[PDB]
Design a protein around this ligand. Structure first.
Ligand SMILES: CCCCCCCCCCC(CCCCCCCCCC)(CO[C@H]1O[C@@H](CO)[C@H](O[C@@H]2O[C@@H](CO)[C@H](O)[C@@H](O)[C@@H]2O)[C@@H](O)[C@@H]1O)CO[C@H]1O[C@@H](CO)[C@H](O[C@@H]2O[C@@H](CO)[C@H](O)[C@@H](O)[C@@H]2O)[C@@H](O)[C@H]1O
Lengths: 433, 48, 257, 367, 618, 180, 75
């Protein structure tokens, strides 16, 4: 492999390939490392190994060819055996953040939750028993956040150690995080196995490698079979996969918010800062061709407020045909008073009479009454003129915009089985490839 | 397919009707399956 | 019904029409003799025209048909019939109509294809539309610059078959060496590393870092010494370890172990 | 839904290639004399106003996914006398081009495969009377929708077809409020031997033999405003496969299918009427229809609405059509859009069909 | 001669569950039960020997258009074959599937089941094999189980049976999920070791003498194990159980069309009120008030995308030009932005149990303390408050001479954002941020010159203070220990550009970042009541310091009238960086107890460059 | 040299020979590359007075790569002949008169990848390519708007190793372009 | 190396050579839409069509703004 087909951790001693080896591919290594002044080598390199071929003879009639092999160390075997130590060399504590590329601190939050059935930031003992008494300060499980339980939070923002941590994932770009590939590495090789087993251990009579001796608290939280067995083989143990790594990461790259579409329709972008709709000419600007939204409001840029940007992108392929119909009344009560009665109906036409889960069709209706009232108030202008050093003549304005909307949803009659809106959890046609 | 489409030399129509040399159509093996017009209509069985 | 009889709809752009024969012949013996050659008719069009104009000073026509991109937001067609202001009907639009609604709760669709009509009863403005929508609504959340992406992995969904410890020594040293991170309690500094995989590509090239292809005998117990808290059979596959090791128990991984 | 539809080869012959007819609800058998009038009714080429004309039509397929799949058409008509005309069309349905390769170098030789299907037809139309004309068309159909691999042959399947058409256009008849004009037309299409995709005697598919009968009327206001209302009925002249059976269990199904498939096209034309347990009222369901209205202003702007309906139990292709046509100097541009109304996904939805016709030569009067 | 018309390796989406389903045997890899899972479709298995496969009554083949053709898509069902020695009395065999199904917007869960005897085997009798679904978080600790005794399709004569005799209505599962909710609420009071639970730990309301009417379904048997959630079904399993006491049953069971029906189409309401006023270009007040009910949403949102929560929010934003309160002769640009707001979100479904509506759970609790706990842990409250003094500067006079000591060069920016939240996770989450910045930028305008061309210097005091206390979702009496994150930092960068000669050009810059660490005790234990404004103008110990120097020289050798052609151009970029090691290094404590200083890091960099033209002409 | 390293075995220890009985080297590498490129070897570009412009260029390339892991010489050779002819026939009569622009592009790319063993005669042909091509195109303006182009592409790709198959491609026909 | 699909008539995966920006490939494959929707990255471009069926499939590779479509062949 070339140096661009893998990376490795020079201190912790593990390689990370650029391509997954999910088949009979064999992985073999030869490495040389240093411990202070000592140098150790574990395989045969091309430089110091035997020559590839030794030839004994003059012409092709009497020549003898001897092709020799390099002796390397096996990391992945040809035939998968989980009862072998070579199985243990694969790291099962690295989690790829989905589609993350260059995760940076202050733009990355991680948390560990126990979903059973709701996301909970801690662990309760099995009823009828309790967690081990008088734990070490690093072995606290009772009333302890799960980042502290799995040793992913023991440092403050500046990576200095703190007593109970700061409640945030410890972002160390060489120990717990892989910046260039967006991977999170745990500080233990089996975090949901031997680590939480040791946290919950009530005595020396329980051994991690003998699941018959667990103390009814390890029988619930210790996910041993995800480390002793393949992922497909660990799907059998259904009651253990309850720990959820939930988080967010912020991708900016360039200056502006990438709305995820290009050549968006004019006026199709709506930006809301904190429940209020910004003005497209004042608080932000839109570059439609590049699909960028730049926030021009000084107080909003440095505000940490989550800005929601909604856009109608027409670069879609495969979406069902959407029938949009409806009307809009614009009664004008006076020269400064408007009443509207918008009614809209959006139906979808499914490709098939059967709708699978996720690919659901909508037959929604939304109707609303709105009212706008804009006036000039010279009283405010005169009051401002009463201020010490203000004598401007620009008129003051007031504007009240109310709106009420009702949404009556439905499902299209096309996707109805025996007269009722139907969604197929499994029609059993997608199996058996 | 050259045996059935453009019959070669030394092959008769009796050689192509044996249930071991004859042509299999999908309408025989899959009578309920609908096949688009102009696509493959025959089953290319693997003979041993 | 129209202001005048003048029809000056000017077209612009280009049209291409290629007609010919495409002959192909691949000398693959595995093919049937009926597949000796493929002589097909190759016909293609590149209609790349636009059409702008006014009809009777009441119809405005604006169309752009270009068969060289995604038609959902490139192939445009707009008919606008605008009677006199005295009439009830103010505008009838056919084609790429728009439905801009100045309401926060109820959002209209900007990209539609259909009929849009507008009536004005003195003070009441009734705008009706019936169309098909060519776009999809998409929402993003941005905090301090760029967008925010959430992720929800589970315990089992780890990254497999990609990350490998280089030895049982490193595997059993990992936890203890990361006890007081960010300080790593390990003086190991891996200087050189070469990795060999199964070669299925069999593609020889001078630009892919040379052409190195060696016979490989990868051993499992190579460079293996014992471990303190780990039994030998969890470190080596050899049936008998009697007379196998020739170094102290906690020795670092090396060929001589 | 659809129960036992008729299985006919080369179905792309039944797809409207021109934007005018596709905007009139896929019917042109009785409309005004048109350059595109080769697929629908060649017999009105004798009534064309211009001496000769060329036409290029484009119908994209699956526009959202791929920009390659399409149905193009090139038509050329030329009337020599005032009684006759020669026409020739070339319809080509193509997937574009698949550039198949098996290596990674960006310069190794790639093999292009373009599975296509084209019909090249030529017709002669003679105006027997002053209001009635006939036409005979010969068509060659070739299908190359297969990709050559191992143990599969991609030889193109060919066939021939004969079309007989007739078109009657009455003189301008005045009425109480307007001076209208009557038109009628019939067309029997794709009368030819079975097309064999496997190049074998046993496995052959019928040609999509078609029968169109249509009639239309023109309301004329001020001699420069026209409103043409047309109505067309269409029927397939291919026997329908039997359903449950007309005697274990698979024995009856196989016997009925074999009996149906051992029927010649010449006999199949006569056998089309009936062959069902239902009566004449149920038999009449086999006819599809389409009604259209086209408004013409100054003979240079046209706005067309159309509605095409098939039977619920076969085909199930019902839709509305909008169309617009503009004439600048000698180039007529037509655009057509389709609003589906059937429970099955029409591949022509969200698709704007385009047509561009040039007309040149001397101007012939119309009776 | 053997002609393989088709030869494939077939892989399925439903995995056989290799593990016990009854707590008595515990070794399912025994009993000699040949348990197969396959699929029967109308394209291939339309001629099966026991029963020809036919679509269930009302099901139709999907029709698609590929190329001007109508293609009837395949119709398939999942077949499960139990043969060999047959099931034990209570042993069960099942196939599972990992999914993500939210079935809270649909009222009914329906399925078609078919049972038949194996050929050449003893006939399976009615109400012996039980077809069951089991869905939830897992298959052993948290699930709903819906069982139905199967009526065996009578065979023996013709293999082609009418679909209403293959897919009988007595075997179709039609389960209302509100029955599951009622069963869950009833089982909330059942102990985990109660006698009402069976050996497997499942609670069947039918087998409970104290419960009237059973589980409310006369055809189905319902059971619940461990507080599952059908608002997110992560695991779905279908299988067959046995009911024959002294018998081992063999048979084939088809499952088809597992669907959700009877959508809840009750709508929603929303209202918005925006009052926006401006006052003589001096004041601007914009108050927005929004209030939405459960089930509201947009047109494009489906069943699971609409709002399952009542939202009630407001937001008042005020802008003042305080600089206009002062005379314009000495212009002051002092904008003041004050934006307050808050939202309250009451969920439709209780955050605990995730699938019982909050009102229904509140009614069926009969415990005032617990009712208050539920109603309080449900609500999601958020309050934001922002104050901004960004861009404070004195505007230059129209006729004013630029000067180095002029105050018009400075610029001030203050920001203070506070967020107070509390929801199902955080009992009280506080986040205060203060950011004060002072910028300076002067540009000079017209042995060697020692007058810099431009000088820049900008400072920043960035303080972040998050307090995050998670809740005990059991009782609102204690809670968890609050977690404090503090990022008190003092950054400052500066630089200047000299043009010592017409050729030389020297650009220097230095950026430093210190961290304020006065909020900690003698140990590494953060203090609780340390305000963010406590010791503001504090410069902490340095944390990072970077220097950069850029020299550009043209080497005026052209003045020498021997080398008038040389165009030498030298460039020298020097960089330095000092980075403070974390306290894990500076105060490392070896296992012998000795404390070692492992020191910081220093980095260096040069960028020498020499571009010469050396024109040999002249 | 893409990557040279210092040898940890080149030290002061009395062990000075490896398993191959070779002295340890101070600097060790795996590959060295000699890349020669005539781009172009020649380019005769000349326009005649009859508007017949000719652009005939020959390019050559060698990519010797010596690998010390297996001590093999991977040699990549490339040759490319290119000919471009351009003519303008003046006033060709079909009653309609205009100029015919003839453009011919001939090409021939040879490519080889051998692996040479030093110890004996085992020259392996690892890869190859042999593709010649010819694109003729004649443009003729029937009017100010309508133009017609006659195009003819002919490509033949031989097999250097057996894993590749000879491929003949011949596109031909007409192209009518109309502008408004 | 602009954009390649190396094995077009494949009984196996797709190798999908392209630029750095990641991909959003999808498959519809003869009729309507049957989205596969993998998440090809810059240096791990391997698909999975080996199991679905045999036919001429439609793919829409998405490198951000680089929406390149085409047809693959399942042998
Ligand atoms: C089987 C297929 C036949 C195809 C016929 C093609 C004829 C091409 C000739 C261009 C043309 C037709 C418009 C074609 C537009 C289609 C473009 C296609 C685009 C595809 C995507 C433009 O004519 C128009 O265009 C104007 C250009 O601006 C012309 O201006 C002027 O145009 C030029 C003065 O003529 C000036 O040079 C130009 O300076 C001016 O400006 C005008 O004359 C006119 O409006 C003129 O047609 C003329 O050519 C003759 C040939 O001998 C044709 O005779 C026919 O020949 C056989 C049939 O070929 C038949 O057997 C035969 O019976 C019949 O006598 C007639 O038709 C004739 O009228």
């Amino acid at each position: 492999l070339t140096t661009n087909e893998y990376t490795f951790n020079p201190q912790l001693g593990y390689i990370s390939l650029q391509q997954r080896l999910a088949n009979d591919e064999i992985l073999a290594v030869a490495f040389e490392y240093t411990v202070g002044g000592k140098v150790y080598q574990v395989g045969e390199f091309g430089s110091d190994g035997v020559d590839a071929t030794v030839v004994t003879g003059n012409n092709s009639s009497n020549q003898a060819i001897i092709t020799q092999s390099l002796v390397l160390k096996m990391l992945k075997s040809n035939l998968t055996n989980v009862k072998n130590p070579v199985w243990n060399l694969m790291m099962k504590n690295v989690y790829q953040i989905p589609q993350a590329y260059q995760i940076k601190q202050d733009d990355f939050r991680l948390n560990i939750l126990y979903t059973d059935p709701s996301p909970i930031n801690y662990i309760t003992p099995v009823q009828g028993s309790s967690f081990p008494p008088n734990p070490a300060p690093d072995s606290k499980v009772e009333q302890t956040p799960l980042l502290n339980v799995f040793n992913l939070d023991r440092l403050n923002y500046n990576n200095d150690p703190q007593a109970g941590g700061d409640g945030f994932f410890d972002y160390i770009p060489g120990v717990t995080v892989d910046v260039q590939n967006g991977r999170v590495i745990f500080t233990t090789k089996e975090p949901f196995g031997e680590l939480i087993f040791n946290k919950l251990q009530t005595g020396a009579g329980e051994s991690y490698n003998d699941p018959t001796t667990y103390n009814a608290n390890q029988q619930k939280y210790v996910f041993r079979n995800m480390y002793r067995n393949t992922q497909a083989g660990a799907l059998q143990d259904s009651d253990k996969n309850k720990f959820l790594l939930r988080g967010k990461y912020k991708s900016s790259g360039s200056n502006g918010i990438p709305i995820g579409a290009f050549n968006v329709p004019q006026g199709s972008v709506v930006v809301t800062a904190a429940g209020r709709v910004l003005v497209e000419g004042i608080d932000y600007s839109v570059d439609y061709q590049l699909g960028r939204v730049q926030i021009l409001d000084p107080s909003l840029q440095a505000s940490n407020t989550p800005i929601e940007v909604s856009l109608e992108n027409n670069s879609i392929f495969g979406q069902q045909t959407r029938r949009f119909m409806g009307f809009n009344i614009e009664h004008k009560i006076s020269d400064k008073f408007v009443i509207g009665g918008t009614y809209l109906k959006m139906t979808e036409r499914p490709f098939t009479q059967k709708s699978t889960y996720g690919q659901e069709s909508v037959n929604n209706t939304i109707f609303g009454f709105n009212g706008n009232y804009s006036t000039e108030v010279p009283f405010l202008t005169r009051l401002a003129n009463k201020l010490p050093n203000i004598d401007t003549d620009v008129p003051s304005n007031l504007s009240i915009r109310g709106e009420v909307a009702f949404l009556r949803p439905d499902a299209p009659k096309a996707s109805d089985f025996q007269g009722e809106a139907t969604i197929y959890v499994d029609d059993f046609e997608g199996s058996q490839s | 397919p050259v045996f059935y489409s453009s019959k070669p030399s030394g092959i008769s129509n009796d050689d192509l009707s044996l249930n071991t040399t004859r042509r299999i159509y999908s309408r025989e093996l899959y009578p309920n399956t609908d096949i688009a017009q102009g696509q493959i209509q025959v089953v290319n069985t693997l003979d041993l | 019904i129209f202001g005048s009889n003048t029809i000056d709809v000017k077209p612009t752009g280009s049209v291409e029409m290629d007609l010919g024969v495409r002959y192909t012949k691949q000398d693959n013996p595995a093919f049937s003799p009926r597949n000796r050659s493929s002589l097909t008719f190759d016909f293609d069009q590149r209609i790349s025209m636009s059409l702008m104009g006014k009809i009777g000073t009441r119809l405005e026509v604006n169309a752009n048909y270009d068969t060289q991109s995604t038609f959902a937001f490139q192939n445009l067609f707009k008919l606008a019939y605008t009677p006199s202001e005295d009439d009830i009907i103010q505008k009838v639009e056919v084609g790429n109509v728009s439905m801009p609604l100045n309401s926060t709760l109820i959002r209209g669709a900007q990209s539609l294809f259909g009929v849009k009509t507008q009536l004005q009863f003195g003070r009441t403005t009734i705008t009706g539309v019936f169309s098909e929508q060519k776009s999809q609504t998409k929402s993003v959340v941005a905090e301090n610059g760029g967008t925010v992406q959430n992720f929800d992995l589970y315990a089992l969904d780890y990254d497999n078959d990609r990350h490998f410890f280089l030895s049982q020594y490193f595997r059993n040293k990992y936890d203890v060496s990361l006890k007081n991170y960010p300080f790593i309690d390990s003086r190991v500094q891996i200087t050189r590393l070469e990795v060999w995989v199964t070669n299925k590509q069999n593609r020889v090239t001078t630009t892919g870092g040379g052409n190195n292809l060696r016979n490989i005998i990868a051993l499992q117990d190579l460079g293996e010494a014992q471990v303190s808290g780990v039994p030998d059979n969890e470190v080596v596959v050899i049936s008998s370890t009697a007379g196998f090791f020739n170094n102290p128990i906690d020795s670092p991984t090396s060929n001589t172990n | 839904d659809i129960e036992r539809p008729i299985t006919t080869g080369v179905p792309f012959l039944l797809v409207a290639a021109d934007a005018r007819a596709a905007g009139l609800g896929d019917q042109g058998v009785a409309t005004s004399s048109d350059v595109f009038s080769q697929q629908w009714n060649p017999a009105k080429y004798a009534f064309a106003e211009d001496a000769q004309g060329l036409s290029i039509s484009y119908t994209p397929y699956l526009t959202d996914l791929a920009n390659d799949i399409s149905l193009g058409q090139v038509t050329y008509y030329n009337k020599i006398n005032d009684r006759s005309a020669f026409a020739g069309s070339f319809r080509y349905f193509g997937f574009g081009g698949i550039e198949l390769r098996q290596t990674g170098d960006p310069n190794e030789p790639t093999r292009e495969v373009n599975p296509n299907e084209f019909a090249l037809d030529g017709s002669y139309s003679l105006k027997l009377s002053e209001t009635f004309s006939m036409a005979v068309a010969a068509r060659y159909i070739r299908s190359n929708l297969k990709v050559a691999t191992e143990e599969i042959d991609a030889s193109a399947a060919g066939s021939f077809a004969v079309d007989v058409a007739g078109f009657y256009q009455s003189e301008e008849i005045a009425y109480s409020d307007f001076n209208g004009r009557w038109r009628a037309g019939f067309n029997i299409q794709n009368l030819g031997p079975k097309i064999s995709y496997d190049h074998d005697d046993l496995s052959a598919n019928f040609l999509p033999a078609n029968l169109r009968v249509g009639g239309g009327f023109d309301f004329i206001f001020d001699d420069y405003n026209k409103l043409g209302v047309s109505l067309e009925l269409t029927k397939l002249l291919v026997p329908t496969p039997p359903g449950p059976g007309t005697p274990s269990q698979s024995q009856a199904d196989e016997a009925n299918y074999k009996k149906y498939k051992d029927i010649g096209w010449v006999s199949g034309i006569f056998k089309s009427f009936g062959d069902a347990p239902g009566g004449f009222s149920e038999e009449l369901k086999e006819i599809t229809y389409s009604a259209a209205a086209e408004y013409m202003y100054q003979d240079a702007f046209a706005m067309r609405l159309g509605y095409y309906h098939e039977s619920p139990m076969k085909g199930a292709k019902q839709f509305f059509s909008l169309g617009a046509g503009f004439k600048y100097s000698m180039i007529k541009v037509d655009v057509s859009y389709l609003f589906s109304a059937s429970k099955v996904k029409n591949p022509l939805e969200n698709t704007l069909r385009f047509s561009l016709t040039f007309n040149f030569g001397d101007k012939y009067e119309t009776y | 001669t053997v002609r393989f018309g088709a030869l494939d390796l077939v892989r399925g989406e439903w995995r056989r569950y290799t593990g016990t389903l009854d707590a008595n045997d515990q070794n399912p890899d025994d009993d000699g039960v040949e348990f197969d899972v396959a699929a029967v479709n109308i394209q291939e298995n339309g001629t099966k020997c026991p029963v020809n496969y036919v679509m269930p009554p009302g099901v139709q083949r999907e029709q698609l258009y590929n190329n001007n053709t109508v293609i009837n898509q395949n119709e398939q069902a999942l077949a499960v074959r139990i043969g060999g020695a047959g099931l034990q009395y209570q042993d069960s065999r099942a196939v599972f599937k990992n999914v993500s199904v939210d079935m809270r917007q649909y009222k009914k869960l329906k399925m078609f089941l078919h049972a038949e005897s194996l050929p050449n085997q003893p006939t399976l009798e009615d109400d012996e094999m039980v077809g069951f679904i089991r869905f939830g978080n897992d298959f052993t600790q948290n699930f709903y189980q819906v069982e139905i005794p199967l009526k065996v399709t009578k065979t023996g004569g013709s293999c082609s049976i009418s679909p209403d005799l293959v897919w009988m209505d007595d075997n179709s599962i039609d389960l209302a999920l509100d029955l599951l909710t009622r069963m869950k609420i009833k089982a909330m009071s059942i102990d985990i070791n109660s006698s009402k639970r069976d050996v497997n730990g499942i609670y069947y309301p039918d087998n409970d003498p104290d419960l009237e009417g059973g589980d409310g379904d006369g055809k189905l048997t319902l059971g619940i194990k461990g507080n599952p959630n059908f608002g997110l079904v992560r695991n779905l399993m279908v299988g067959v159980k046995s009911r024959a006491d002294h018998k081992d049953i063999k048979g084939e069971v088809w499952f088809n069309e597992l669907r959700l029906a009877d959508l809840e189409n009750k709508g929603g309401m929303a209202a918005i009120l925006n009052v926006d006023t401006n006052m003589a270009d001096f004041a601007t007040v914009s108050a927005t008030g929004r209030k939405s009910t459960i089930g509201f949403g947009s047109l494009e949102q489906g069943a699971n995308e609409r709002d399952r929560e009542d939202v009630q929010q407001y937001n008042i934003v005020t802008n003042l030009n305080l600089g206009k309160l002062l005379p314009k002769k000495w212009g002051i640009n002092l904008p003041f932005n004050y934006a307050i707001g808050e939202e309250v979100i009451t969920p439709e479904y209780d955050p605990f149990n995730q699938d019982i509506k909050l009102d229904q759970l509140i009614r069926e609790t009969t415990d005032q303390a617990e009712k208050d706990n539920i109603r309080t842990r449900a609500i999601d409250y958020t309050k934001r408050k922002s104050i901004n003094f960004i861009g404070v500067r004195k505007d230059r006079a129209p006729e004013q001479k630029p000067h180095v000591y002029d105050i018009e060069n400075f610029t001030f920016s203050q920001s203070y954002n506070q967020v107070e939240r509390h929801d199902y996770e955080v009992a009280d989450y506080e986040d205060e941020q203060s950011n004060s910045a002072v910028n300076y930028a002067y540009t000079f305008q017209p042995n060697f010159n020692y007058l810099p061309s431009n000088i820049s210097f900008n400072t920043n005091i960035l303080r972040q203070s998050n307090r995050q206390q998670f809740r005990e979702v059991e009782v609102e009496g204690i809670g968890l220990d609050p977690l404090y994150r503090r990022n008190f930092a003092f950054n400052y960068q500066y630089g200047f550009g000299f043009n010592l000669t017409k050729s030389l050009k020297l650009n220097y810059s230095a950026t430093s970042n210190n961290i304020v660490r006065n909020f900690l005790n003698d140990d590494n234990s953060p203090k609780e009541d340390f305000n963010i404004w406590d010791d503001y103008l504090d410069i902490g110990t340095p944390n990072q310091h970077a220097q950069q120097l850029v020299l550009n020289y043209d080497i005026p050798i052209n003045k020498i009238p021997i080398f008038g052609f040389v165009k030498a151009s030298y460039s020298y970029t020097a960089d330095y960086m000092w980075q403070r090691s974390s306290t894990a290094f500076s105060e490392y404590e070896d296992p012998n107890g000795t404390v070692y200083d492992l020191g910081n890091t220093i980095q260096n960099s040069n960028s020498n460059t020499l571009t010469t033209t050396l024109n040999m002409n002249t | 040299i893409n990557q040279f390293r210092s040898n940890f075995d080149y030290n002061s220890s009395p062990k000075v020979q490896d398993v191959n009985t070779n002295f340890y080297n101070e600097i060790i590498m795996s590959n060295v590359n000699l890349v020669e490129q005539f781009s172009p070897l020649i380019r005769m570009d000349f326009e005649l007075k009859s508007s017949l412009r000719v652009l005939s260029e020959i390019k050559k390339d060698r990519a010797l790569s010596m690998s010390f892991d297996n001590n093999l010489l991977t040699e990549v050779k490339g040759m490319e002949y290119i000919i471009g002819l351009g003519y303008r026939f003046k006033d060709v009569i079909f009653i309609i008169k205009s100029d015919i622009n003839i453009k011919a592009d001939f090409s021939l790319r040879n490519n080889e990848t051998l692996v040479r063993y030093l110890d004996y005669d085992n020259n392996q042909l690892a890869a190859g390519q042999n593709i010649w091509s010819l694109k003729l195109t004649a443009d003729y303006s029937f009017s100010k708007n309508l133009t017609a182009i006659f195009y003819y592409d002919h490509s033949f790709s031989k097999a250097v190793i057996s894993t590749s198959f000879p491929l003949t491609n011949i596109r031909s026909g007409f192209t009518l372009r109309y502008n408004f | 190396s602009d954009f390649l699909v190396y094995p077009n008539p494949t009984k196996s995966n797709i190798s999908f050579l392209f630029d750095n920006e990641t991909a959003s490939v999808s498959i519809y494959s003869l009729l309507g839409q049957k989205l596969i929707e993998k998440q090809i990255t810059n240096q791990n471009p391997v698909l999975s069509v080996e199991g679905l069926t045999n036919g001429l499939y439609f793919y829409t590779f998405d490198a951000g703004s680089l929406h390149k479509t085409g047809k693959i062949i399942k042998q």
